[PDB]
Design a protein around this ligand. Structure first.
Ligand code: MG
Ligand code: MG
Ligand code: MG
Ligand code: MG
Ligand code: MG
Ligand code: MG
Ligand code: MG
Ligand code: MG
Ligand code: MG
Ligand code: MG
Ligand code: MG
Ligand code: MG
Ligand code: MG
Ligand code: MG
Ligand code: MG
Ligand code: MG
Ligand code: MG
Ligand code: MG
Ligand code: MG
Ligand code: MG
Ligand code: MG
Ligand code: MG
Ligand code: MG
Ligand code: MG
Ligand code: MG
Ligand code: MG
Ligand code: MG
Ligand code: MG
Ligand code: MG
Ligand code: MG
Ligand code: MG
Ligand code: MG
Ligand code: MG
Ligand code: MG
Ligand code: MG
Ligand code: MG
Lengths: 121, 252, 52, 233
RNA sequence: UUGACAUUGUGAAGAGACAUAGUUUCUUUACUUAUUCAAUGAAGCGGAGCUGGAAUUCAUUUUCCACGUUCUAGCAUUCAAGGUCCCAUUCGGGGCUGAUCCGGGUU
RNA sequence: GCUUGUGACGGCCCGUGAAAAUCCACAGGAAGGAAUAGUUUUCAUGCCAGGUCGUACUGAUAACCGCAGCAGGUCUCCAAG
RNA sequence: GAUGGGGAAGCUCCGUUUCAAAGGCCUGAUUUUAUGCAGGCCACCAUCGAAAGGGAAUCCGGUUAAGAUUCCGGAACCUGG
């Protein structure tokens, strides 16, 4: 017989079989529990008097919130821990390195009403 | 003492060349199959100014013999070449301004530009505005061809070494006075940081062989041997004669 | 241009949004004439090939 | 014929993209490929000295094929076959009280370089096969010279691997017979004779002949053509 | 920078001694695998052959060159259309040829 | 009128005065697609989502640098009669 | 400024597409079944580097002790699905 027939003069690395990992032992013994559940996302109410106003006037709950949490995780956490529906979530880093979430509830909920059925006032 | 100006240039730091604007290196085509058996046609699609270059470039597109695609090359424009013009490159091609033929295929006294020193090196000799070379002989059993370069020197190279028929354009450039320091200023501005030039004889000793003394003066012969050593070669290096040149120059 | 309907990116004619009309008059005339001379050129050296 | 059409393309410089062709002669091979090719070239451009040049002369396909044919009747035990034999003798020897001679005298090929060498020195081989590869050639270059001296008929044979096959190792470097069943003495004496004629006899003359000094063919043509016309006007 | 030694190998003519057999030393001019320099998405290298055809045949071919592109600022891509052989004829799809052989030395 | 923007021009150059992401178009026509029913989301309308960090104030004869609430230094836009 | 490399006793120096086997896309094949192979292209060789360069898209009114082209209100627009 005889030879191959390459019409390209560039020789490339043969596309060769890639096996997937089948360990002889488990990477880390026990997976870590959820590192950011809702009780870690939303830390306290903020009950500053100018916050207490957004509640009365703006249908808005202010929370000190985990620095590690994003608008997604803040929104879900409120929704879960409070029954409440969220319209949008504004956030900001305070000047003491902690996060403030301005949470607007939809028109069906009275945030003031929530506020005292959660406790503060 | 210190390290003199002409030693500092080699590190290249502030002395590398101001290049942002240049069109791209100028070369003949890669000496492929077409060009060394037949000839291949192109169009000059543009002739264009290159930053800090005397002569204009000429953008010439060709078909890729092997792939469906246009491959554009950068030439130095020989005088008279023009947009639209058809350019032919190959052994078996025709002796006209603009084309590129191997020094073997053109009669003596032909006048060519941008010629190769070894075939394939995509052009080395005679590229400065106004310059060209003349084929002054052939030796076919050996296929050397003998040229005279702009300098006066006469080399011999492969009759395969390619050249382009004509002279390089924008000649005459240096006949007109720069007039003011500003015009040189912008001149070297797009070349390299070599201007202006402090006379070493205006320097202090730390600085330069010529520095110091209570009147300015070189103090010793400014004709320096080839065997000198860096820090020493300033002046007339390896000068085999010196003084005002009288009588027709012109190598025989 | 990716927020605008195709009619804003062409005129009808071949090479619409890309070449200047007067220039396609040219492509066409030259294409024609050069394809035709290609006929004139063959039969001229076709005849050559039996009269030399 | 119908609305179908002849349109021959013209692939002749400055027109029609060149077609796909076989560029195999051109491809930019990996270094490792480039290197083992060039080693083979280099060894042939040089003048190779006789005591290596004596290899390359490898036993012929015919004589050889029938040397493996005899030899393959003398494979060594397999693992099973040696498990098999032991029980057969752990049984009998311990109780039936056989003198560790509830086993037939083994006849197999002799292998392992240092083994084969001492066999030869001690004049017991009757047919050494040396393999023609073996990259530190030194392991083996002295084997002809040695077999000539011990008056031991030998043969340089293609297949360092194929000597491995006949002994159940991936390669084997040498292979030798020393014993043989009476029913094969004949076969051997024939082989020993042919083989002695292509090697052991030719030895001293092989010893005077350098090898290589062999041009590539772009250079050969440059010489057949140059040394055709230059003399024959 | 200059010499020597080492990298350092292969021919050939020429000078040099046992003192006008060829082991050996250098000069020279050949070789290319060491070493060196360029080049390219290592693409068309070397050799042979088809045909053309100058040639003048001193038996018959001894050769030597040729051996797809030049009025034009178009167009040139889908392993190529054509031709030819397959599968069991679907719809798709494959070989060859088109594109001559040989050597795997990218030049 | 003044500031700024912009257009068609004109002067200058041995100075002829960046790149890339990204976007669109055309040449091409592989392929796909209907009448007992296909093709169309570069036309309209419709539904969902859009994270992370910065965002106060000073910017100077007191928030900057000159040991300082220093007659110094420190880049810029808007500009009435 | 990493990387195959080449220097260097070595901390490290050189090279940046560099004498490197340098990679990933559209779907078809799947209707054991989830993604192995079946075409084919593309050979581009990292990456960092601009809060004045390039760049998808928001405005007016109102509001605070202190925020606002960011909130409230109304009215839009871009990108992806
Ligand atoms: Mg209310
Ligand atoms: Mg924010
Ligand atoms: Mg010093
Ligand atoms: Mg530079
Ligand atoms: Mg300066
Ligand atoms: Mg001066
Ligand atoms: Mg001066
Ligand atoms: Mg002074
Ligand atoms: Mg001094
Ligand atoms: Mg001096
Ligand atoms: Mg002085
Ligand atoms: Mg003076
Ligand atoms: Mg339109
Ligand atoms: Mg169309
Ligand atoms: Mg057996
Ligand atoms: Mg020397
Ligand atoms: Mg090449
Ligand atoms: Mg202004
Ligand atoms: Mg201009
Ligand atoms: Mg457009
Ligand atoms: Mg298909
Ligand atoms: Mg739409
Ligand atoms: Mg502000
Ligand atoms: Mg102040
Ligand atoms: Mg201080
Ligand atoms: Mg001050
Ligand atoms: Mg580095
Ligand atoms: Mg970056
Ligand atoms: Mg920026
Ligand atoms: Mg910017
Ligand atoms: Mg406002
Ligand atoms: Mg407020
Ligand atoms: Mg404010
Ligand atoms: Mg709003
Ligand atoms: Mg609205
Ligand atoms: Mg959309």
């Amino acid at each position: 017989k005889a030879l191959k027939v390459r019409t390209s003069a560039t020789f490339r690395l043969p596309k060769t079989l890639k096996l997937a990992r089948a360990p002889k032992y488990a990477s880390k013994a026990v997976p870590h529990y959820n590192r950011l559940d809702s009780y870690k996302v939303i830390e306290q109410p903020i009950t500053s008097e100018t916050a207490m106003k957004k509640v009365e006037d703006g249908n808005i709950l202010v929370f000190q919130v985990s620095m590690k949490a994003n608008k997604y995780q803040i929104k879900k956490a409120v929704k879960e821990l409070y029954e409440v529906d969220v319209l949008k979530v504004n956030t900001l880093v305070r000047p003491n390195g902690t996060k403030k979430a301005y949470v607007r509830l939809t028109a069906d909920y009275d945030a003031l009403d929530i506020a005292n059925r959660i406790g503060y006032i | 003492g210190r390290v003199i100006r002409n030693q500092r240039k080699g590190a290249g730091s502030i002395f590398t060349s101001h290049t942002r604007l240049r069109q791209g290196a100028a070369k003949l085509r890669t000496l492929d199959y077409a060009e060394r058996h037949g000839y291949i046609r192109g169009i000059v699609k543009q002739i264009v100014h290159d930053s800090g270059r005397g002569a204009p470039l000429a953008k010439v597109v060709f078909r890729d013999p092997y792939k469906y695609r246009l491959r554009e090359e950068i030439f130095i424009a020989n005088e008279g070449v023009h947009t639209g013009q058809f350019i032919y490159a190959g052994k078996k091609a025709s002796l006209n301004v603009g084309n590129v033929l191997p020094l073997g295929s053109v009669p003596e006294g032909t006048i060519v530009s941008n010629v190769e020193e070894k075939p394939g090196d995509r052009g080395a000799l005679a590229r400065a505005s106004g310059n060209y070379v003349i084929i002054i002989g052939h030796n076919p059993d050996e296929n050397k061809t003998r040229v005279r370069l702009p300098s006066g020197a006469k080399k011999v190279i492969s009759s395969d070494a390619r050249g382009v028929i004509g002279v390089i354009a924008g000649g005459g450039r240096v006949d007109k006075p720069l007039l003011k320091a500003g015009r040189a200023f912008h001149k070297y501005r797009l070349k390299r940081n070599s201007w202006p030039k402090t006379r070493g004889v205006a320097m202090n000793p730390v600085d330069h062989p010529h520095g110091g003394g209570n009147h300015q003066h070189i103090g010793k012969a400014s004709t320096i041997s080839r065997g000198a050593v860096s820090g020493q070669k300033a002046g007339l290096i390896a000068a085999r004669r010196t003084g005002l040149l009288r009588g027709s120059q012109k190598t025989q | 241009y990716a927020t605008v309907s195709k009619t804003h990116k062409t005129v009808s004619r071949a090479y619409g949004g890309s070449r200047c009309a007067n220039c396609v008059k040219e492509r066409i005339i030259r294409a024609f004439l050069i394809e035709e001379q290609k006929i004139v050129k063959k039969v001229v050296k076709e005849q050559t090939e039996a009269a030399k | 014929n119908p609305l179908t059409h002849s349109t021959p393309k013209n692939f002749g410089i400055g027109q029609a993209v060149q077609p796909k062709r076989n560029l195999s002669r051109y491809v930019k091979w990996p270094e490792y490929v480039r290197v083992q090719r060039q080693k083979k070239i280099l060894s042939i451009r040089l003048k190779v000295p006789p005591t290596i040049a004596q290899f390359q002369y490898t036993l012929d396909r015919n004589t050889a094929a029938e040397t493996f044919k005899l030899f393959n009747k003398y494979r060594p035990e397999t693992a099973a076959e040696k498990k098999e034999r032991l029980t057969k003798e752990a049984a009998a020897v311990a109780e039936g009280k056989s003198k560790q001679d509830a086993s037939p005298k083994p006849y197999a090929v002799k292998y392992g370089l240092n083994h084969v060498v001492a066999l030869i020195e001690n004049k017991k081989a009757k047919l050494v096969l040396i393999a023609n590869d073996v990259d530190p050639i030194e392991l083996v270059v002295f084997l002809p010279a040695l077999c000539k001296k011990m008056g031991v008929p030998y043969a340089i044979v293609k297949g360092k691997a194929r000597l491995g096959t006949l002994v159940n190792q991936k390669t084997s470097a040498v292979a030798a017979l020393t014993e043989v069943r009476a029913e094969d003495e004949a076969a051997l004496a024939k082989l020993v004779s042919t083989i002695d004629a292509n090697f052991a006899d030719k030895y001293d003359e092989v010893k005077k002949h350098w090898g290589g000094g062999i041009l590539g063919n772009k250079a050969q043509a440059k010489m057949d053509k140059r040394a055709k016309n230059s003399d024959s006007a």
